[PDB]
Amino acid sequence: DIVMTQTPLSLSVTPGQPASISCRSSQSIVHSDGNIYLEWYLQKPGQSPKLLIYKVSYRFSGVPDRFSGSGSGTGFTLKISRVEAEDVGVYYCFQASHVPYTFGGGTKLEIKRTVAAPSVFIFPPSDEQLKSGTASVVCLLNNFYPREAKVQWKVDNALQSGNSQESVTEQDSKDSTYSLSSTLTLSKADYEKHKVYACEVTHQGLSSPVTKSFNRGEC
Amino acid sequence: QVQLVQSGAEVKKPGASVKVSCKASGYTFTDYYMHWVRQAPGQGLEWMGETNPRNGGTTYNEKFKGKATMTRDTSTSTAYMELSSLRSEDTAVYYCTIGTSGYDYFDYWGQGTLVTVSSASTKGPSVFPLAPSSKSTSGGTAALGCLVKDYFPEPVTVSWNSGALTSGVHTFPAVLQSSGLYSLSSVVTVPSSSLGTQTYICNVNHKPSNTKVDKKVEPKSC
Ligand SMILES: Cn1c(CNc2ccc(C(=N)N)cc2)nc2cc(C(=O)N(CCC(=O)O)c3ccccn3)ccc21
Structure with missing residues (x-):
């Protein structure tokens, strides 16, 4: 199985300041079609996860410009250029390039x-x-x-x-x-x-x- | 109008079975694979498997093989997740989710289902008002609420005025009483000027006991 290692476990950011969340796959995550199916989700307590980024760097419809994704090989990063109150919760990276699909451990974002x-x-x-x-x-x-x-x-x-x-x-x-x-x-x-x-x-x-x-x- | 509506929370006995449902609407049910994701304590999120709604074909995460069984009913547009040999490790929130752009992402998710594995008996909540008074006022505002005690298992959901009151609402995580039963509080801050004209009702739902309690919260003279 592909192990997705997310760092750090927790983050505390002042609004208007940038945040970076790192994700590391134990092996390569290139699907048989050539795409890296690497996504980022935001989950607030009591609520279901919400899609942000997909295919490493594509921003989903309605997601603000401040969220960006990047990566290559085994290293992938979620970047929030200017953190806002609404960004609170747990972030998860996720791979669907190889069965079984696997999530990262999660990163809790706290607003300072x-x-x-x-x-x-x-x-x-x-x-x-x-x-x-x-x-x-x-x-x-x-x-x-x-x-x-x-x-x-x-x-x-x-x-x-x-x-x-x-x-x-x-x-x-x-x-x-x-x-x-x-x-x-x-x-x-x-x-x-x-x-x-x-x-x-x-x-x-x-x-x-x-x-x-x-x-x-x-x- | 795409919606994934999951069945209410359930409590089942160790070694027994639970069947979680996921009713889909606002799209052609057979057009997209249905996925099941587990959110267990200290386990983060885990993909359990996918179901092809056209043919019933399944692909399980090895970890959930023989443990989990995925099926669907095309007549009612409902996906099903059945868990057998229930153990404490199965107490988790289960979500159904779909991807509408091939294998690119999960854009739609269900609201989640809390399955509790316990030999203990189901017990409905005791709902008490948290009356507003001079001792619950602050700068023109008045706080009020509902105290939900002695229920088992989790969860209880709390809404106010049937979901029409959401601003200033704080519904707290439950605490575990020494008896093993749960207790939670739900509060709201409102104008202190309209306690005479506004009706404040907390709507308490406890699916395991099939209980719905609507408690009207009245002012007091503290
Ligand atoms: C494995 N898989 C998925 C998994 N979904 C998924 C979503 C999101 C993610 C993610 N989060 N990255 C990861 C995975 N979706 C698929 C759609 C097709 C497809 O070609 N057909 C037509 C096939 C026919 O009938 O000829 C199809 C269409 C609807 C129903 C059945 N079959 C084949 C295979 C698919």
Whole structure:
């Protein structure tokens, strides 16, 4: 089988700056018809791969001019002359010159935008969940950059441990930011023992931590 | 108008079978070979094989021989991918794709199908509103959402107002609860001025359990 070695594994580029993704076949990839069937695809999380380049250097219809492909023998390159927010995701080179057709390992492109502070939001548990004997409190950290953000759950100013779960979005294709959702889950019995439910947020965009809170019984 | 519509996510038991479908429209089904691509965790993308829709002729990737069976139904314009001897390594997103310019490229792809291999039982989600309040406001904006808990297996899809609300929507990757069930949140930022006139409904779909939950999210007084 043809092994397609893609380098680097990850890339971080400021918009308006160039990017280069390299692909290396373990053997030659000239099809019996004389064409090198080498393609480049862009995949965003949750979405299907999208065609960019084919036959090494041909740009597919509707693909912007900034994307170009080149190569010879075993070495092939995808070039993005000026990176834009919409370019985020995983790039894959692919060969269909020899059966079985094979993809490269992928290269994740990250956009290196300006520092953006998160907007903090808190949500109390719903009456419907409380009826089942559980209370989940959600803290939202919206549209921030860089990705590194710290959430600390405080109940009546007491730091929580082992009762929360969090998830971060993939990078946004329009504003190049990340969003974070954290869920504090405790039994209805423990929930009803306290007043102040707070999520304390730390991020490079904040000069000091931001606390967002609500008081049980006020909702 | 070319479209490749794949069947919903499925959960199957170890050693059992799964049959994934790919309904084609907007073109003459028999004019282009149908390909199957696997997106498995830590495996990137892998071409499984191609099917000639005119004669049912197949060319498999050796890795998927005896494991995968490709067929098509010209009457309904539907390609099929069947996997047997199911194991944890088969838990992946499966895509069908076509090339309309000979062997040059894959220009059309299906939306993907998540197949989960597990002995565990299917469990529908618990949908809770994330009510907007003074504690979820920021510079004239209000955040709201839906908390989707205790479901199995993945995925759950979330839309708002039947797909008519997409701007400011963040649907987060699921987290795994200690019980082995999944939880996700879906949020949206809207004008805080129109919470009285706009209706906000999160549409939660969980194909393995055949569940569709439309939760209206109402404001609170925090
Ligand atoms: C192997 N193969 C592919 C693979 N597709 C592919 C797409 C994209 C890529 C890629 N991504 N590079 C890689 C591969 N497409 C083919 C079309 C023909 C063709 O000549 N005929 C007419 C033959 C008759 O009936 O006489 C045909 C047409 C429609 C249906 C059946 N046969 C033959 C062989 C083909």
